[PDB]
Design a protein around this ligand. Sequence first.
Ligand code: TPP
Ligand code: TPP
Ligand code: CA
Ligand code: CA
Lengths: 671, 670
Amino acid sequence: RHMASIEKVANCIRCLAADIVQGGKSGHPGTPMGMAPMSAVLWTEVMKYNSQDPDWVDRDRFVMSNGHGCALQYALLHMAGYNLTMDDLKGFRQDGSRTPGHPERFVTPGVEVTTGPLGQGIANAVGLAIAEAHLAATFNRPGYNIVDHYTYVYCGDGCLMEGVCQEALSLAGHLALEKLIVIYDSNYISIDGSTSLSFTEQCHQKYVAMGFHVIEVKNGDTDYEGLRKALAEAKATKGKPKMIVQTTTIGFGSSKQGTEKVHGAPLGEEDIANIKAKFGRDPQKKYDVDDDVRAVFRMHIDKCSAEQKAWEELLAKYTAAFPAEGAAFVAQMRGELPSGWEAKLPTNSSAIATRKASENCLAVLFPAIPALMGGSADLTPSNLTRPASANLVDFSSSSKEGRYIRFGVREHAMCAILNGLDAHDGIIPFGGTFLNFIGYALGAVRLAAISHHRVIYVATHDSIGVGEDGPTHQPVELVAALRAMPNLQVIRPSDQTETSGAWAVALSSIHTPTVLCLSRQNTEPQSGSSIEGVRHGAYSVVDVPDLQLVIVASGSEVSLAVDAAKALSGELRVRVVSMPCQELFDAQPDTYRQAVLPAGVPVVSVEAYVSFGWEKYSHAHVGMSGFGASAPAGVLYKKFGITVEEVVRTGRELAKRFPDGTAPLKNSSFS
Amino acid sequence: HMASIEKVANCIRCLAADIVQGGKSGHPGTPMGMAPMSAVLWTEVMKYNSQDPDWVDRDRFVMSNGHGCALQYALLHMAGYNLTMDDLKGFRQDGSRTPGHPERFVTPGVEVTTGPLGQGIANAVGLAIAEAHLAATFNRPGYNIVDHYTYVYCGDGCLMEGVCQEALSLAGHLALEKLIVIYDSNYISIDGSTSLSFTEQCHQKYVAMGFHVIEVKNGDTDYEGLRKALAEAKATKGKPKMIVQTTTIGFGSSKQGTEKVHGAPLGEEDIANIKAKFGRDPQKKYDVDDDVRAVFRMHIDKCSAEQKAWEELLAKYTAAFPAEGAAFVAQMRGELPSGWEAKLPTNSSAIATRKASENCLAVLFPAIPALMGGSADLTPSNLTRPASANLVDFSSSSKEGRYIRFGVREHAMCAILNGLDAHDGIIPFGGTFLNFIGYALGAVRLAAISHHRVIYVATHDSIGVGEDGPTHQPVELVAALRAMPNLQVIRPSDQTETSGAWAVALSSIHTPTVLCLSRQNTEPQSGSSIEGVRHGAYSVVDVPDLQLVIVASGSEVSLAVDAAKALSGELRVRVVSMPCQELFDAQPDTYRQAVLPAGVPVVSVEAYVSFGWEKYSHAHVGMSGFGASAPAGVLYKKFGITVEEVVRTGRELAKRFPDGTAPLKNSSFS
Ligand SMILES: Cc1ncc(C[n+]2csc(CCOP(=O)(O)OP(=O)(O)O)c2C)c(N)n1
Ligand SMILES: Cc1ncc(C[n+]2csc(CCOP(=O)(O)OP(=O)(O)O)c2C)c(N)n1
Ligand SMILES: [Ca+2]
Ligand SMILES: [Ca+2]
């Protein structure tokens, strides 16, 4: 029944964090010890959450952007009563534990997104805040405040130095995300040592200039009243995102506090013993949480638990007065798609750019899938991600119900924000940009793959087809890179029908991110295209019995393969295989793959990209050998030898070299 | 006659408009908006010689907002550079010297290749660092042989990119006083008004970053203000400068001030009206008044005299400082002092290749004075600052320092390395964890495209990282870098190969190199050799009439060697070390055939995904997905990257494809 003082709670946190890192013989004790005071106040007095229900949809979201200090989050999750035991803590950074080196979504209860790569968390948080603001504007009604929570995000010096972070904070300021509260742990230390070695900005002046309401707590090591007031002011102030700048001593309490030595290595048994004694704690007991400290957390959680119950009742009344909205709310938060959407997608007609084919799909999808939310990185009129017929409204501080986000020229932040939007629940996010600049955001793309986020990237201008912009704008090696990436779908549709198929696949992939590679130039529609085919990854668009050659292609090059096949009609019986998504094809059973790419039959692949990686399917490739050039698309295709005649010549030589079932077996056949 | 500054600017505007119109593609907006500032900068302030684009002490000019390159092409022509009116008429056309975006080497006077937003600014920071460092290294009392400014144009898009923000942050921290950023603020982007996604108080923001911000409220017609801004910029010391000029995109056009003039030809009619509005002939295109040309010529004559005087100063300097003079000339040519390779370390004890790299740098730093490196806040992990080198950090108070603390800014670091290389006199390298090179692919791609000699010291190359987990363990990045044209990805197995890797990187004048280094110790191989690394792949363990080949790289070579020994009684096995696939593919067919003979089954071993290995091996022992959080040793067993797994795979392969029946690889019959 006795309640520990806020200081006792803070010191308990500091020590548990230290023991966690020590037990793992690896980790970062520094930051966790420095942010303990703020965490104590935040987790036992301010933040709204239920440790018995991590899935409560109206809970405040918490994100630790400086993921290396996750020992702190694990300690807090345990003390608060989440399903994370002392055994989990003792398994820190060890094989198969629920407590890996950096926060991982799904691995640990209470962790919203996976961080570690600096700057990502901050951008994820911006996405989490955008989601709350948009859903509140969409579902809230007079007398029914069913969506109302804050987004709290910890970050360090490392985070602020990263461009992805600067991009996100910039957009957050512009969007005036008032419920976003960034807690910046300023302790003047990084791996190299003092921050003055490479980072000396007037942060307060800087973030105010970016539209942030900055609140300083000069002594974040012991000023509990300051910490309390800072959070209260942050919640009270409106119209701007907040940034609480607390000045703290990294590794506070340790003999090596305030130095880079406590950044990423265990403090050691002796130093830990002195730290405990210094705080008046037993220097002999490890992983020891006082029962009166647990009582403080329990009292807080009981209050929030009551809030949830009260919230559940409100949603019940809400659902009664608004049957339809209630059903939608429940449906969106589950990520369910209104039925009948796929059948509404467009099919081939006139020759158009798959870029336009994507727009035609969004013209149908926006109205059919209210959860859909997306935008472009200042390439709206180029990516064609905002169909006029959809009558879209831009998301802004003055129109939070808007569904189109103007990301500005911020590819990296855009992709990281998409992860945040997905992590929230109730949103199906997509973002557009030129395929070549997805390279600017591979840091976020990788995390979408690791965290199993359903995010969609509308990547237009996918090749030399771009034309005049030149080599710096023409991808030739990026698709290969994305294809090497685990759990990532890279779909390159050939026409309207395959494009609708691509969106269908992207939308139904609940745990896999998808890159839609779209062309700038028109492509000729194929009569053999189908959504069912796209779902299989690869399939025949042109078949013939007892085939002597297979020509596999994707996107804008399928027409070349088809024409090449015609030109070879009299000589060879050629099958043309459209392969929009290699990841889906590889996942098909052996019998299906054997039926598409029969062993022993020579295969020629055609794609305006480098050949790297194609050896797993073809015996010869007609594509790029280097970077592009500045000239009209048509000129570039002839220039680089990516033509029908070249395909015909290559197919002819292959058939000649490997006649009747003698084509070299590929690794997949005997693997 | 001497055209007034306004006539010069209007001439620039019209030529840019005709250039874009002639290509039936391009961006006329920004070019027209920055004509006024350009007229002043190029005919009154900037020091350069159009008759000698290679003059080493010339001011540098970068157009970070590369889409508006029509402006730079117009300026280069009017200034007298080797770019004719025909080149201009070839704008955005096949094989012309005037591509859609500035391309290094393709056009005279273009310092770096821009197009991808934010890169130009970062490059400029690198150019400014190089100048400051070279000045501190070579200047002597009375001998100011290195002294020039770095001018860089940028727009709203540039300032929104993280790589730009990272670079400006470091520029402010380093107090690069000779860096002058000219920011064209016209409140317009592709989507339209900047108020749709960009509303920062730039003045206060950049002052907070350490910049001296100068504003020119009317950059469309206030020439006195423009002249004053540049003058103030040159006079103000201790901080980089950002001149914020407010202009009207497409000034003069009927669609001025709108996104419509952003990236589409103005049209024949609007162009005619623009000329008439400026008192110019609405019928003549690509027309440069002779009095405007005389203005540029007068300026170039002066700068030309400055170069000659500079050449004389360098001659006196060389007479008073024989050694330094020789070094200056040599460095500016990118020449390496002889004897450096022979000093590199060879195998000894088992150490991480990360440590092996440090041992190399301990020799290279003192042997190659032009060498300048740093790490993205990972110095104690990348081991890029060998204590014996007695290095000093580059800072505003120590410009002669050779080590750069980039902070947690991988992207800007890489773009800055490109800028350092573009300047001349510097051999740059930057370090960070391999996994985060992924944050900098934008700049890495341009190093490959522009043929920059930059070296990336990328440590913690795999699950060898251990405890940090999947977010820090690369499994797919190397494949991505291998797919990239003109990029060398070297993964040395031990000290000797690591010395070979550095040798290759340092001698590749036109190709960037990524050094994939291990965190954990690796076992040295008696078969390793520098000659082998230069060949990409070579046998480290050979046997006559082989039945199986095991190819591997980096820390996995020891697994292949041990697997080979384990198979001793069963199969005749050759072990191939493949530290660099790019160099191997470049070898003649006879050499490749000799290393990986056709018909012989091949097993590759590497702690990365298999994507791409099919071009060499018939089976792969490596990663099938992302990593996990646990000690390295535990991870290798967990994922099956062990000697027993290699032995088991080699056995099944030799069994399935005995004596010459192994499937032929594409390269063999290609
Ligand atoms: C993108 C990225 N680059 C580099 C790293 C390596 N790294 C981990 S923590 C860190 C610096 C930590 O500094 P900071 O955020 O200031 O806090 P500290 O824990 O030292 O207080 C770095 C560079 C990383 N995790 N992510
Ligand atoms: C990294 C990157 N992302 C996107 C683009 C596409 N792009 C080219 S220009 C531009 C708009 C930039 O506008 P700005 O520099 O503000 O000036 P304007 O010419 O419209 O005045 C965009 C988004 C690009 N070139 N590079
Ligand atoms: Ca810090
Ligand atoms: Ca602009």
